[PDB]
Amino acid sequence: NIGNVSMYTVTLSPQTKLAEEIFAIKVDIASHPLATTLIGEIASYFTHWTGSLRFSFMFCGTANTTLKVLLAYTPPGIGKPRSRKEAMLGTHVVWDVGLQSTVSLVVPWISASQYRFTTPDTYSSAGYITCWYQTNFVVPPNTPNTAEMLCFVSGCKDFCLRMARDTDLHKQTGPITQ
């Protein structure tokens, strides 16, 4: 998908098995795939971060396509949830698709220390955010059986970066000439 707009979309569709997993990524602001987002790029210019993160999702199926999804944040000290039941025991939002296309899940700052390192460090790995089918993707007849979802990220009022440093998300391997 890299090199294509499709790298930004997640496909949803009618499921035959219940509570299927849709996606899973680390919450760490400068880890992949969050790294190249604007907030991830800026975070990569600093050594420490703190605060809550705002993850938003916009459903892009037809207006007659319905769906309920469960977005969960799993605080650290445990592996990523292996099932919806395991995931919902943590922080989560049950999203019902309707007139309003977008939902937001806030990943609260839940840490032992006041700050965490922006670069991939065990001790300060913030946890995971997973997505699961709460009910199912449903459509009337004569309607596309798949739909896309867009994912956004930004920082809440308490977000903050500290200790300026050079980024490792960009390099120079030769002279830049005229």
Binding site: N4, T9, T37, L38, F59, E148
Partner: protein
């Protein structure tokens, strides 16, 4: 209702019964140049309603394989009535804009367009050394550019939508004034942008201040593909004013 909008400019009025609010670029409404920021000393001409009206460009067709489209301002309006005349008879010009992108489908359709207004969208060329995009290519007029069609040439600009045609990632275009046309939600996008530049006025012939970029981030899909789904763009200058009158400049 907050789903409705009516925009009146000069002798034109545009409506939409399914909008997603409107965006005012950088929170600044367009306004005329003040004497504190002005530099050119001749009295500016302000066509008012004969130039500050909606001009509708050639429509484009959106299909399952579309990679996107872009236009540059004021270039796109170079042949639009009084506004166009003024930008060639004067050395300097200044203007804000109301951009209204239109695209209706059906409730059984799905698709998403990212509509963005980029200031100083300096295009790149790919694998061509220090050779830059040629004037002709960045001045396509109301026809704009259909990404993924143009038959290559040396001075031809990048056509990579995921790299914003300039070496940066598409996902971050949201940092610029923008809206989305998500077929299940709205059938139009409205962006009002002020004049943005490091100088109070500038040549409208050799400097494109803004670029309108439309990228389908979610493929157009439905069970009635034979029905063509166009995208139409209507742009209205705002507070257009020009200075440095002379003969009409002829390009090429």
């Amino acid at each position: 209702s907050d789903r409705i909008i009516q925009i009146t400019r000069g002798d034109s009025t545009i409506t939409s019964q399914d909008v997603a609010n409107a965006v005012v670029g950088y929170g600044v409404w367009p306004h005329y140049l003040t004497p504190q920021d002005a530099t050119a000393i001749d009295k500016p001409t302000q066509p008012d309603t004969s130039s500050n009206r909606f001009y509708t460009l050639d429509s484009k067709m959106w299909n399952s394989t579309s990679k996107g489209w872009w236009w540059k301002l004021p270039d796109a309006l170079k042949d639009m009535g009084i506004f166009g005349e003024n930008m060639f008879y004067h050395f300097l010009g200044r203007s804000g804009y109301t951009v209204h992108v239109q695209c209706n489908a059906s409730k059984f359709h799905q698709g998403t367009l990212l509509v963005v207004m980029i200031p100083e969208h300096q295009l790149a060329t790919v694998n061509k050394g220090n050779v830059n995009a040629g004037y002709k290519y960045t001045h396509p007029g109301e026809a704009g550019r259909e990404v993924g069609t143009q038959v290559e040439n040396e001075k031809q600009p990048s056509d990579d939508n995921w790299l914003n045609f300039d070496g940066t990632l598409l996902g971050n275009l949201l940092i610029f004034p923008h809206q989305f046309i998500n077929l299940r939600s709205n059938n139009s996008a409205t962006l009002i942008v002020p004049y943005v530049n490091a100088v109070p006025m500038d040549s409208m012939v050799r400097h494109n201040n803004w670029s309108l970029v439309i990228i389908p981030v979610c493929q157009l899909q439905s069970n009635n593909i034979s029905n063509i789904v166009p995208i139409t763009v209507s742009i209205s200058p705002m507070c257009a004013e020009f200075s440095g009158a002379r003969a009409k400049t002829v390009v090429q």
